[PDB]
Amino acid sequence: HMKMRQPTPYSDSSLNNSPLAADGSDFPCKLRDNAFVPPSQETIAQIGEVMPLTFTGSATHGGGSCQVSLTTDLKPSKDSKWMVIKSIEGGCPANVDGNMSGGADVPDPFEFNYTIPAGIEPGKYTLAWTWFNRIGNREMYMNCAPITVTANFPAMFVANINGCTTKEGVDIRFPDPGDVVEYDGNPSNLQPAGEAAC
Ligand SMILES: *[C@@H]1O[C@H](CO)[C@@H](O)[C@H](O)[C@H]1NC(C)=O
Ligand SMILES: O=C1O[C@H]([C@@H](O)CO)C(O)=C1O
Ligand SMILES: [Cu+2]
């Protein structure tokens, strides 16, 4: 149970910590009433700028693995096409063995980053954070935020809301993580070589 803090998600005041519905019904972005209201301040990401990726919550579930992905859709739906710009395998959204202290609203001390790469054209996008928790029930977490990019990619990995089911206890390694892959966890938790993520 975690949520993205930066970049600021759409409709943050109605955005909760819960994972996506196991049946896929609220993929993408936790579909719900008025799900796609932009925050007041525009999140501007210059190409090549190191941008913050930060979280709120203490129920870190031993970490896991995350992606950062972009779509041109400003009201994403099941038909939205996503472009992965970063994969974090292990240690996301925290490199601890279980949960942390603080409440549902605590700023997560473990912080991350992403950079818009050279192949993304300037324009408005939705950015998604997705997270596959290491410990606990097999879930997929997802929050979405508008960003404006100012002056060839894998499709998003989707699991646990379909037939692809991940293995409990491991930091998964995405089949097609892209050219920007970061390992932020303990090597002993990385999914063993030769096992598929599903
Ligand atoms: C982004 O975060 C990763 C993981 O902590 C770190 O290795 C890297 O140095 C960070 N980038 C910058 C520019 O600080
Ligand atoms: O509505 C918008 O207009 C500009 C657009 O030019 C961005 O590509 C901007 O920053 C918005 O949020
Ligand atoms: Cu949880």
Author numbering: 26 to 176, 198 to 244
Which statements did the authors publish about this structure?
The catalytic capabilities of lytic polysaccharide monooxygenases (LPMOs) were first discovered in 2010 and LPMOs have since garnered significant attention due to their unique catalytic power and biotechnological applications. These enzymes play a pivotal role in biomass degradation, through activation of C–H bonds at the C1 or C4 position of scissile glycosidic bonds, allowing the degradation of recalcitrant substrates such as crystalline cellulose or chitin. The histidine brace is a unifying feature of all LPMOs, whereby two histidine residues in the LPMO coordinate the copper ion found in the active site. Previous studies have shown that AfAA11B from Aspergillus fumigatus has exceptionally high oxidase activity, low reduction potential and the ability to degrade soluble chitooligomers. Adding another unique feature to AfAA11B, this enzyme has the lowest reduction potential and highest oxidase activity of any characterized wild-type LPMO.
Residues 152–172, likely comprising a mobile surface loop (see below) could not be modeled in the electron density maps. Looking specifically at the active site, AfAA11B shares common LPMO features, including the universally conserved histidine brace coordinating a copper ion (His1 and His61). Despite the observed differences in substrate specificity between AA11 LPMOs, their second spheres are virtually identical, with all three AA11 structures having a tyrosine occupying the proximal axial coordination position of the copper, as well as an asparagine and glutamate. The closest contacts of Glu139 in the wild-type enzyme are 2.8 Å for the tyrosine and 4.5 Å for the copper. AfAA11B contains an extra loop region comprised of 15 residues, indicated in green, which may prevent the LPMO from binding to insoluble chitin.
